[PDB]
Amino acid sequence: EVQLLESGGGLVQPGGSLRLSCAASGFTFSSYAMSWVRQAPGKGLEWVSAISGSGGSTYYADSVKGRFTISRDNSKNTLYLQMNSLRAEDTAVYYCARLRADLGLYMDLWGRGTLVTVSSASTKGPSVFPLAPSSKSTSGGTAALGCLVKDYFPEPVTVSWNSGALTSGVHTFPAVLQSSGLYSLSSVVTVPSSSLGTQTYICNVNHKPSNTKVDKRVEPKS
Amino acid sequence: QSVLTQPPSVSAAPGQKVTISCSGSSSNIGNHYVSWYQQLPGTAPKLLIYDNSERPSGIPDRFSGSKSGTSATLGITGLQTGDEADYYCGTWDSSLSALVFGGGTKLTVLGQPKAAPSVTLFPPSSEELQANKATLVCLISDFYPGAVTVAWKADSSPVKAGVETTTPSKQSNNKYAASSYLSLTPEQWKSHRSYSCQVTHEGSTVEKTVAPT
């Protein structure tokens, strides 16, 4: 019966710009102040900016001061956030939030958010690196090996072992989005220590989006 | 940002009660009022508690908040799987001149029983080193509840630069798993005696350590 709805989320390059909008309804928009709060992927909330009820008074986090620009059009019930010179740090979900300061500070109604992904990076095939034997006194125990898939875009890559012949003891981890904006993951598989001497292990890494396939043998260290 | 200090992860069984603490200073919690936000995974934050101890209408009486000096507290009785979420503590900081929040506390309603994390720290490959790059790889698996703290050591000095770590996602065995990557120069790797990955699950820590030679 009352809500805020963010729009204009997009991908932009480093040094680029972008205008976020927030449509409001169910209340007198100009009767309350507003706020932009952002959530970097897998990090905590961070306040960005806020604007007065009159619509004339603007405050900013020291991180976004002089680069971002809060604004509102009370005739059309809309908040906006002009973001200039955007850098990698700015990548997050941006939620428009109604601000209420009766007694103390609290944001009493949020939108669904909208993603902004500053990217210097386009479509890149992965580099594939050979994981250590890790014969670090595991003795009779399970000794496991793997492959590093580094600096590929966009998702996803697929990993198989000995062309999919070996799948028992395999663990392939989700990728990380790096500060570069570039995806990296690893796939590890545990086969007996004694077997290493006379068993070949090769990870097959296929990146459909760059049509890169790499076969990479992995066997002890010196 | 994590201006305010919250505990990364708290856990309880359905029907029980939990308290989440928020640590600050004079400039923030000291003189100004605190609020609590529930972010259900994927969805936006929602106002839970405002003005230290006030609930919006429709937020149940299970939820309550307290504050004294430079710390505040969120109480939840009658725990249910629905409450399983990330919890944020929010106030005003006058010395930063900015609205500030805690790093956020992940809640894990205990359905299945706990498991201790297995850590496997592969070092930079000879191959990678020759390419003028060096990635320490920390693989963490078979733990519950789905919330860990990952710390990195250059010898015995803490390292938070060049660190990227995954959000815990359950693999085919209904158990959480995550990964952390430390980016070094070949010089950094060779100019230290050892590097270590410390994974802190609940009250415990498992550390793995790697030597260049």
Tab-separated table of C-alpha atoms in Angstrom:
chain	number	residue	atom	x	y	z
A	1	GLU	CA	0.000	0.000	0.000
A	2	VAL	CA	3.178	2.227	0.281
A	3	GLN	CA	6.527	1.571	-1.505
A	4	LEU	CA	9.794	2.819	-3.094
A	5	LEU	CA	11.071	1.310	-6.433
A	6	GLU	CA	14.692	1.852	-7.685
A	7	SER	CA	15.556	1.998	-11.454
A	8	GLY	CA	18.429	2.913	-13.838
A	9	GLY	CA	20.892	0.321	-12.447
A	10	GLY	CA	23.455	-0.633	-15.140
A	11	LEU	CA	27.044	-1.674	-16.009
A	12	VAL	CA	29.418	1.357	-16.553
A	13	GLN	CA	33.225	1.542	-17.213
A	14	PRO	CA	35.737	3.191	-14.789
A	15	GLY	CA	35.439	7.041	-14.950
A	16	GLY	CA	31.848	6.661	-16.319
A	17	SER	CA	28.533	8.156	-14.997
A	18	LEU	CA	24.934	6.955	-14.240
A	19	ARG	CA	21.598	8.354	-12.879
A	20	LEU	CA	19.593	6.184	-10.387
A	21	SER	CA	15.861	7.008	-9.935
A	22	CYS	CA	13.544	5.973	-7.029
A	23	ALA	CA	9.740	6.056	-7.623
A	24	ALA	CA	7.678	6.508	-4.402
A	25	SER	CA	3.896	6.141	-3.724
A	26	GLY	CA	1.374	5.838	-0.827
A	27	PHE	CA	2.448	8.973	1.170
A	28	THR	CA	3.264	12.723	0.695
A	29	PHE	CA	6.813	12.236	-0.772
A	30	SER	CA	7.896	15.849	0.044
A	31	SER	CA	6.682	15.362	3.694
A	32	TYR	CA	9.729	13.085	4.466
A	33	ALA	CA	13.515	13.245	3.767
A	34	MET	CA	15.186	10.434	1.699
A	35	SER	CA	18.525	8.519	1.735
A	36	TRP	CA	20.761	6.390	-0.585
A	37	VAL	CA	22.365	3.317	1.183
A	38	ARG	CA	24.534	0.852	-0.847
A	39	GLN	CA	25.629	-2.793	-0.140
A	40	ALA	CA	28.925	-3.900	-1.818
A	41	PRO	CA	28.694	-7.628	-2.787
A	42	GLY	CA	29.045	-9.740	0.427
A	43	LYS	CA	29.892	-6.653	2.590
A	44	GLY	CA	27.882	-4.559	5.125
A	45	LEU	CA	25.549	-1.571	4.438
A	46	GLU	CA	27.212	1.847	3.708
A	47	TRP	CA	25.424	5.249	3.762
A	48	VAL	CA	26.031	7.298	0.529
A	49	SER	CA	23.772	10.410	0.688
A	50	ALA	CA	20.455	11.962	1.896
A	51	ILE	CA	18.180	14.952	0.971
A	52	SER	CA	15.857	17.278	2.980
A	53	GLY	CA	12.007	17.319	2.988
A	54	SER	CA	11.988	20.842	1.439
A	55	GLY	CA	14.209	19.132	-1.223
A	56	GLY	CA	16.883	21.833	-0.657
A	57	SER	CA	19.686	20.440	1.625
A	58	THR	CA	22.064	17.600	0.552
A	59	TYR	CA	24.605	15.539	2.623
A	60	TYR	CA	27.200	12.967	1.374
A	61	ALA	CA	29.597	10.267	2.687
A	62	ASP	CA	33.275	11.471	2.399
A	63	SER	CA	33.740	8.526	-0.095
A	64	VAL	CA	31.177	9.971	-2.628
A	65	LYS	CA	31.480	13.755	-1.805
A	66	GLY	CA	31.815	15.885	-4.996
A	67	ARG	CA	31.334	12.840	-7.355
A	68	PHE	CA	27.678	11.882	-6.516
A	69	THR	CA	24.677	14.302	-6.437
A	70	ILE	CA	21.363	13.630	-4.584
A	71	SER	CA	18.219	15.352	-6.012
A	72	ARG	CA	14.387	14.979	-5.919
A	73	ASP	CA	11.289	16.140	-7.897
A	74	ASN	CA	8.414	16.277	-5.337
A	75	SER	CA	5.855	17.139	-8.130
A	76	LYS	CA	6.582	13.648	-9.696
A	77	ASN	CA	7.343	11.761	-6.377
A	78	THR	CA	10.934	10.785	-7.463
A	79	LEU	CA	14.407	10.710	-5.807
A	80	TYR	CA	17.586	10.570	-7.997
A	81	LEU	CA	21.394	9.989	-7.567
A	82	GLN	CA	23.690	11.318	-10.369
A	83	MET	CA	26.991	9.366	-10.031
A	84	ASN	CA	30.046	10.757	-11.919
A	85	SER	CA	33.697	9.497	-12.195
A	86	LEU	CA	32.497	6.055	-10.865
A	87	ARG	CA	35.426	3.727	-9.828
A	88	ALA	CA	35.585	-0.033	-8.913
A	89	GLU	CA	34.820	0.768	-5.210
A	90	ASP	CA	31.330	2.116	-6.231
A	91	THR	CA	30.070	-1.376	-7.396
A	92	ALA	CA	27.089	-2.311	-5.105
A	93	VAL	CA	23.256	-2.522	-4.788
A	94	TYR	CA	21.881	1.025	-4.136
A	95	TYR	CA	18.660	1.095	-1.997
A	96	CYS	CA	16.557	4.324	-1.764
A	97	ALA	CA	15.342	4.623	1.883
A	98	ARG	CA	12.771	6.944	3.566
A	99	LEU	CA	14.570	8.782	6.453
A	100	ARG	CA	12.771	9.441	9.812
A	101	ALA	CA	14.612	11.394	12.586
A	102	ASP	CA	11.872	11.614	15.294
A	103	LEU	CA	13.982	11.119	18.511
A	104	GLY	CA	16.922	9.467	16.595
A	105	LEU	CA	18.023	8.275	13.102
A	106	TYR	CA	16.198	5.336	11.371
A	107	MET	CA	15.230	4.492	7.729
A	108	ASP	CA	11.591	3.278	7.983
A	109	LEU	CA	10.880	2.058	4.361
A	110	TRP	CA	13.349	0.717	1.697
A	111	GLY	CA	13.171	-0.164	-2.035
A	112	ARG	CA	14.112	-3.552	-3.619
A	113	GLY	CA	17.588	-2.077	-4.497
A	114	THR	CA	19.246	-1.746	-7.962
A	115	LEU	CA	22.723	-3.070	-8.978
A	116	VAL	CA	25.558	-0.797	-10.231
A	117	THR	CA	28.610	-2.763	-11.530
A	118	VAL	CA	31.608	-0.511	-12.435
A	119	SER	CA	33.583	-2.805	-14.859
A	120	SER	CA	37.000	-2.111	-16.519
A	121	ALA	CA	36.834	-5.787	-17.669
A	122	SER	CA	35.140	-7.436	-20.732
A	123	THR	CA	35.165	-11.131	-21.963
A	124	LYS	CA	38.527	-12.853	-21.065
A	125	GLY	CA	39.584	-16.560	-21.119
A	126	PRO	CA	41.178	-18.036	-17.938
A	127	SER	CA	44.852	-18.688	-16.991
A	128	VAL	CA	45.143	-22.291	-15.563
A	129	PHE	CA	47.794	-22.928	-12.817
A	130	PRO	CA	49.037	-26.361	-11.419
A	131	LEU	CA	48.258	-26.997	-7.696
A	132	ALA	CA	50.970	-28.363	-5.324
A	133	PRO	CA	51.102	-32.095	-4.405
A	134	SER	CA	50.792	-31.104	-0.650
A	135	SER	CA	52.714	-34.289	0.379
A	136	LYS	CA	53.140	-32.470	3.765
A	137	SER	CA	53.200	-35.634	5.982
A	138	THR	CA	49.539	-36.601	5.123
A	139	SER	CA	51.169	-40.128	4.944
A	140	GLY	CA	48.530	-42.929	4.538
A	141	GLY	CA	45.742	-40.273	4.621
A	142	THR	CA	43.739	-38.688	1.764
A	143	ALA	CA	46.052	-36.357	-0.259
A	144	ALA	CA	44.119	-34.016	-2.603
A	145	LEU	CA	45.148	-32.071	-5.764
A	146	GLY	CA	43.372	-29.424	-7.899
A	147	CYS	CA	43.518	-26.626	-10.540
A	148	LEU	CA	43.384	-22.779	-10.226
A	149	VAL	CA	41.137	-21.058	-12.871
A	150	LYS	CA	42.101	-17.326	-12.680
A	151	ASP	CA	40.996	-14.058	-14.398
A	152	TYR	CA	38.120	-15.181	-16.728
A	153	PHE	CA	34.944	-13.190	-17.734
A	154	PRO	CA	32.043	-13.557	-17.849
A	155	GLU	CA	30.888	-16.691	-15.939
A	156	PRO	CA	30.907	-19.609	-16.135
A	157	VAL	CA	33.807	-22.126	-16.606
A	158	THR	CA	33.338	-25.948	-16.267
A	159	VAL	CA	35.960	-28.311	-14.707
A	160	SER	CA	36.236	-32.098	-15.358
A	161	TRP	CA	39.109	-34.466	-14.311
A	162	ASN	CA	40.733	-36.973	-16.779
A	163	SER	CA	37.946	-35.936	-19.266
A	164	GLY	CA	35.253	-36.662	-16.569
A	165	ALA	CA	36.634	-40.203	-15.819
A	166	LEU	CA	37.386	-39.103	-12.174
A	167	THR	CA	34.442	-37.504	-10.204
A	168	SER	CA	34.547	-39.301	-6.755
A	169	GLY	CA	36.499	-36.998	-4.335
A	170	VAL	CA	36.104	-33.874	-6.614
A	171	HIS	CA	35.156	-30.468	-5.042
A	172	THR	CA	34.746	-27.413	-7.379
A	173	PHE	CA	34.240	-24.100	-5.481
A	174	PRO	CA	32.163	-21.038	-6.486
A	175	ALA	CA	34.129	-18.216	-8.235
A	176	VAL	CA	35.115	-14.872	-6.585
A	177	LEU	CA	34.571	-11.467	-8.301
A	178	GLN	CA	38.075	-9.862	-7.863
A	179	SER	CA	38.822	-6.091	-7.376
A	180	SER	CA	39.755	-6.290	-11.140
A	181	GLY	CA	36.064	-7.265	-11.753
A	182	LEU	CA	37.471	-10.649	-13.003
A	183	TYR	CA	36.172	-14.136	-11.913
A	184	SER	CA	38.509	-16.834	-10.395
A	185	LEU	CA	37.736	-20.334	-8.885
A	186	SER	CA	39.425	-23.683	-8.007
A	187	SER	CA	38.495	-27.414	-8.330
A	188	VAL	CA	40.264	-29.925	-5.973
A	189	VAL	CA	40.008	-33.775	-6.006
A	190	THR	CA	41.329	-36.276	-3.403
A	191	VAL	CA	42.887	-39.584	-4.705
A	192	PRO	CA	45.221	-41.843	-2.541
A	193	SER	CA	48.854	-40.659	-1.845
A	194	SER	CA	50.346	-44.058	-2.952
A	195	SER	CA	48.502	-43.669	-6.354
A	196	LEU	CA	50.404	-40.405	-7.286
A	197	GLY	CA	53.556	-42.377	-8.333
A	198	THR	CA	51.665	-44.142	-11.211
A	199	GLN	CA	48.326	-42.218	-11.760
A	200	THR	CA	48.014	-39.221	-14.208
A	201	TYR	CA	45.639	-36.352	-13.138
A	202	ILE	CA	44.587	-33.613	-15.673
A	203	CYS	CA	41.831	-30.955	-15.117
A	204	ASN	CA	39.870	-29.975	-18.289
A	205	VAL	CA	38.822	-26.260	-18.053
A	206	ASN	CA	36.240	-25.119	-20.685
A	207	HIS	CA	35.199	-21.390	-20.860
A	208	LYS	CA	32.196	-21.302	-23.294
A	209	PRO	CA	31.918	-17.434	-23.284
A	210	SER	CA	35.530	-17.049	-24.685
A	211	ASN	CA	35.453	-20.637	-26.206
A	212	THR	CA	38.739	-21.467	-24.324
A	213	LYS	CA	39.405	-25.138	-23.350
A	214	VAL	CA	42.670	-25.967	-21.431
A	215	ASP	CA	43.914	-29.450	-20.337
A	216	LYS	CA	46.492	-29.097	-17.481
A	217	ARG	CA	48.446	-32.053	-15.918
A	218	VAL	CA	49.152	-31.735	-12.107
A	219	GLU	CA	51.872	-33.921	-10.377
A	220	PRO	CA	54.213	-33.156	-7.281
A	221	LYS	CA	56.798	-30.317	-6.731
A	222	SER	CA	60.594	-29.603	-6.674
B	1	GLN	CA	31.306	-0.375	5.512
B	2	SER	CA	31.720	-1.825	9.078
B	3	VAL	CA	32.138	1.499	11.061
B	4	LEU	CA	30.278	-0.188	14.021
B	5	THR	CA	31.562	-3.636	15.302
B	6	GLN	CA	29.012	-6.538	15.275
B	7	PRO	CA	29.783	-10.274	15.769
B	8	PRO	CA	30.082	-11.942	12.296
B	9	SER	CA	27.907	-15.063	13.121
B	10	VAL	CA	25.495	-16.195	15.941
B	11	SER	CA	23.504	-19.510	16.027
B	12	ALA	CA	20.541	-21.018	18.012
B	13	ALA	CA	17.914	-23.851	17.775
B	14	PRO	CA	14.218	-23.111	16.879
B	15	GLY	CA	12.155	-21.733	19.842
B	16	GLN	CA	15.298	-20.342	21.626
B	17	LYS	CA	16.385	-16.661	22.140
B	18	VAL	CA	19.622	-14.898	20.924
B	19	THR	CA	21.282	-11.502	21.639
B	20	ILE	CA	23.345	-9.595	18.987
B	21	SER	CA	25.730	-6.930	20.434
B	22	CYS	CA	26.916	-3.685	18.718
B	23	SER	CA	30.247	-2.060	19.819
B	24	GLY	CA	30.893	1.667	19.013
B	25	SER	CA	32.313	4.811	20.735
B	26	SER	CA	31.212	8.253	22.146
B	27	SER	CA	30.903	9.765	18.590
B	28	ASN	CA	28.238	7.191	17.443
B	29	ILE	CA	26.408	4.961	20.036
B	30	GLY	CA	27.698	7.193	22.907
B	31	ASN	CA	25.304	10.172	22.422
B	32	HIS	CA	22.950	9.091	19.529
B	33	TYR	CA	20.181	6.406	19.220
B	34	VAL	CA	20.592	2.951	17.542
B	35	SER	CA	18.420	0.942	15.053
B	36	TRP	CA	18.351	-2.750	13.888
B	37	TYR	CA	17.805	-3.928	10.251
B	38	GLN	CA	16.900	-7.515	9.117
B	39	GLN	CA	18.204	-8.382	5.590
B	40	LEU	CA	16.677	-11.796	4.579
B	41	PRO	CA	19.131	-13.332	2.030
B	42	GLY	CA	18.678	-11.741	-1.452
B	43	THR	CA	16.002	-9.174	-0.338
B	44	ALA	CA	16.603	-5.532	0.801
B	45	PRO	CA	16.984	-4.539	4.499
B	46	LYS	CA	13.778	-3.943	6.589
B	47	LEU	CA	13.378	-1.710	9.718
B	48	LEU	CA	13.250	-4.063	12.761
B	49	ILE	CA	14.123	-1.761	15.749
B	50	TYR	CA	14.458	2.089	15.882
B	51	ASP	CA	15.286	4.547	18.743
B	52	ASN	CA	17.153	1.743	20.673
B	53	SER	CA	14.032	-0.247	21.817
B	54	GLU	CA	11.073	0.686	19.487
B	55	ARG	CA	9.385	-1.807	17.065
B	56	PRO	CA	7.312	-0.693	14.021
B	57	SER	CA	3.675	-2.075	14.084
B	58	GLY	CA	3.605	-5.609	12.534
B	59	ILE	CA	7.164	-6.431	13.817
B	60	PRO	CA	6.447	-9.003	16.607
B	61	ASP	CA	7.239	-8.677	20.374
B	62	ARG	CA	9.923	-11.447	19.999
B	63	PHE	CA	12.241	-8.662	18.672
B	64	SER	CA	13.579	-6.008	21.115
B	65	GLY	CA	16.682	-3.801	21.539
B	66	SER	CA	18.729	-2.274	24.411
B	67	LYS	CA	21.635	0.245	24.684
B	68	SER	CA	23.960	1.740	27.379
B	69	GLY	CA	27.183	3.803	26.930
B	70	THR	CA	29.068	2.723	23.734
B	71	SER	CA	27.154	-0.593	23.078
B	72	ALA	CA	23.588	-1.702	22.079
B	73	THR	CA	21.862	-5.148	21.916
B	74	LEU	CA	19.099	-6.861	19.815
B	75	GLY	CA	17.010	-9.641	21.485
B	76	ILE	CA	14.988	-12.273	19.499
B	77	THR	CA	12.819	-14.846	21.424
B	78	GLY	CA	10.735	-17.600	19.691
B	79	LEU	CA	13.424	-18.199	16.987
B	80	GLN	CA	11.990	-19.648	13.696
B	81	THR	CA	13.752	-20.548	10.359
B	82	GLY	CA	12.026	-17.375	8.924
B	83	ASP	CA	14.253	-15.138	11.165
B	84	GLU	CA	17.461	-16.728	9.610
B	85	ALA	CA	18.993	-13.507	8.090
B	86	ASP	CA	21.783	-10.852	8.186
B	87	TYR	CA	21.207	-8.348	11.071
B	88	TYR	CA	22.555	-4.733	10.909
B	89	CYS	CA	22.975	-2.207	13.779
B	90	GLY	CA	22.659	1.461	12.678
B	91	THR	CA	23.109	4.902	14.340
B	92	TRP	CA	24.653	8.406	13.679
B	93	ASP	CA	28.447	9.203	13.904
B	94	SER	CA	29.102	12.955	14.523
B	95	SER	CA	32.971	12.697	14.251
B	96	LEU	CA	32.696	11.027	10.763
B	97	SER	CA	29.550	13.233	10.162
B	98	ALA	CA	27.854	10.151	8.568
B	99	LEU	CA	25.087	7.548	9.201
B	100	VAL	CA	27.013	4.342	10.167
B	101	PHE	CA	26.249	0.562	10.414
B	102	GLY	CA	27.852	-2.630	11.823
B	103	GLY	CA	29.589	-5.180	9.505
B	104	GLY	CA	26.388	-7.269	9.979
B	105	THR	CA	25.610	-10.493	11.948
B	106	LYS	CA	24.436	-13.638	10.014
B	107	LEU	CA	21.803	-15.633	12.042
B	108	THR	CA	21.763	-19.488	11.640
B	109	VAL	CA	18.604	-21.169	13.099
B	110	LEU	CA	20.093	-24.672	13.840
B	111	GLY	CA	18.097	-27.294	11.837
B	112	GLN	CA	20.957	-29.776	11.099
B	113	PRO	CA	23.896	-30.192	13.562
B	114	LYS	CA	27.214	-28.222	13.544
B	115	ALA	CA	30.319	-29.249	11.535
B	116	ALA	CA	33.966	-28.022	11.962
B	117	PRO	CA	35.592	-26.510	8.799
B	118	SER	CA	38.326	-28.430	6.838
B	119	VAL	CA	40.983	-25.989	5.455
B	120	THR	CA	43.402	-26.818	2.546
B	121	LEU	CA	45.947	-24.031	1.746
B	122	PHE	CA	47.676	-24.614	-1.666
B	123	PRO	CA	50.629	-22.161	-2.228
B	124	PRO	CA	51.654	-20.108	-5.334
B	125	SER	CA	52.684	-22.532	-8.169
B	126	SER	CA	56.223	-22.448	-9.747
B	127	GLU	CA	54.277	-21.758	-13.016
B	128	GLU	CA	52.417	-18.704	-11.499
B	129	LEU	CA	55.642	-17.307	-9.889
B	130	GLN	CA	57.437	-17.367	-13.315
B	131	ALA	CA	54.391	-15.350	-14.644
B	132	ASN	CA	55.249	-12.526	-12.097
B	133	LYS	CA	52.074	-13.294	-10.029
B	134	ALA	CA	51.449	-15.199	-6.742
B	135	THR	CA	48.021	-16.374	-5.399
B	136	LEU	CA	47.688	-18.126	-2.003
B	137	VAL	CA	44.510	-20.304	-2.246
B	138	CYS	CA	42.544	-21.203	0.954
B	139	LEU	CA	39.721	-23.762	0.366
B	140	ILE	CA	37.261	-24.130	3.335
B	141	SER	CA	34.663	-26.979	3.322
B	142	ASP	CA	32.279	-29.202	5.384
B	143	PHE	CA	31.131	-26.720	8.090
B	144	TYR	CA	27.781	-25.555	9.628
B	145	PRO	CA	26.535	-22.922	10.449
B	146	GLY	CA	27.149	-21.097	7.110
B	147	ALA	CA	29.245	-18.134	8.386
B	148	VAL	CA	33.077	-18.102	8.897
B	149	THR	CA	35.736	-15.438	9.632
B	150	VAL	CA	38.906	-15.678	7.430
B	151	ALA	CA	42.235	-14.052	8.550
B	152	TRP	CA	45.632	-14.103	6.717
B	153	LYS	CA	49.168	-13.967	8.252
B	154	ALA	CA	52.438	-12.748	6.639
B	155	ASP	CA	54.755	-14.615	9.072
B	156	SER	CA	52.741	-13.556	12.214
B	157	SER	CA	51.623	-10.040	10.982
B	158	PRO	CA	47.912	-9.729	9.966
B	159	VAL	CA	47.164	-9.144	6.194
B	160	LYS	CA	43.813	-7.648	4.934
B	161	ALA	CA	45.166	-6.191	1.587
B	162	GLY	CA	44.910	-8.328	-1.620
B	163	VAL	CA	42.294	-10.612	0.081
B	164	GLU	CA	39.059	-11.786	-1.676
B	165	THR	CA	36.750	-14.429	-0.028
B	166	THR	CA	33.493	-16.181	-1.137
B	167	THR	CA	30.045	-16.195	0.583
B	168	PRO	CA	29.420	-19.748	2.027
B	169	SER	CA	27.193	-21.872	-0.325
B	170	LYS	CA	26.157	-25.510	0.460
B	171	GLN	CA	27.720	-28.207	-1.850
B	172	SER	CA	26.099	-31.589	-2.837
B	173	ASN	CA	26.415	-32.823	0.817
B	174	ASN	CA	24.116	-30.034	2.245
B	175	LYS	CA	27.286	-28.555	3.931
B	176	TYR	CA	28.628	-24.972	3.391
B	177	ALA	CA	31.940	-24.247	1.586
B	178	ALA	CA	33.840	-21.005	0.741
B	179	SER	CA	37.237	-19.865	-0.697
B	180	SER	CA	39.781	-17.038	-0.025
B	181	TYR	CA	42.543	-15.722	-2.375
B	182	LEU	CA	45.547	-13.608	-1.226
B	183	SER	CA	47.208	-11.685	-4.150
B	184	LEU	CA	50.992	-11.128	-3.607
B	185	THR	CA	53.983	-10.112	-5.786
B	186	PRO	CA	56.660	-12.866	-6.124
B	187	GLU	CA	58.875	-10.531	-3.957
B	188	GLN	CA	56.274	-10.467	-1.094
B	189	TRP	CA	56.009	-14.321	-1.195
B	190	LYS	CA	59.815	-14.928	-1.118
B	191	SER	CA	60.563	-12.032	1.383
B	192	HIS	CA	58.562	-13.725	4.245
B	193	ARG	CA	59.364	-16.859	6.318
B	194	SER	CA	55.773	-18.273	6.029
B	195	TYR	CA	52.122	-17.362	5.214
B	196	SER	CA	49.013	-18.699	7.070
B	197	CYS	CA	45.204	-18.832	6.488
B	198	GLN	CA	43.171	-18.693	9.777
B	199	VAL	CA	39.468	-19.771	9.514
B	200	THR	CA	37.472	-18.890	12.705
B	201	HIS	CA	34.267	-21.041	12.928
B	202	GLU	CA	32.074	-20.321	16.033
B	203	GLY	CA	34.554	-20.072	18.993
B	204	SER	CA	37.293	-22.157	17.240
B	205	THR	CA	40.060	-21.468	14.638
B	206	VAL	CA	41.750	-23.870	12.128
B	207	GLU	CA	45.008	-22.460	10.611
B	208	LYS	CA	46.958	-23.880	7.600
B	209	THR	CA	50.547	-22.679	6.833
B	210	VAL	CA	52.752	-22.860	3.678
B	211	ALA	CA	56.530	-22.572	3.035
B	212	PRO	CA	58.149	-21.497	-0.271
B	213	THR	CA	61.006	-24.026	0.302
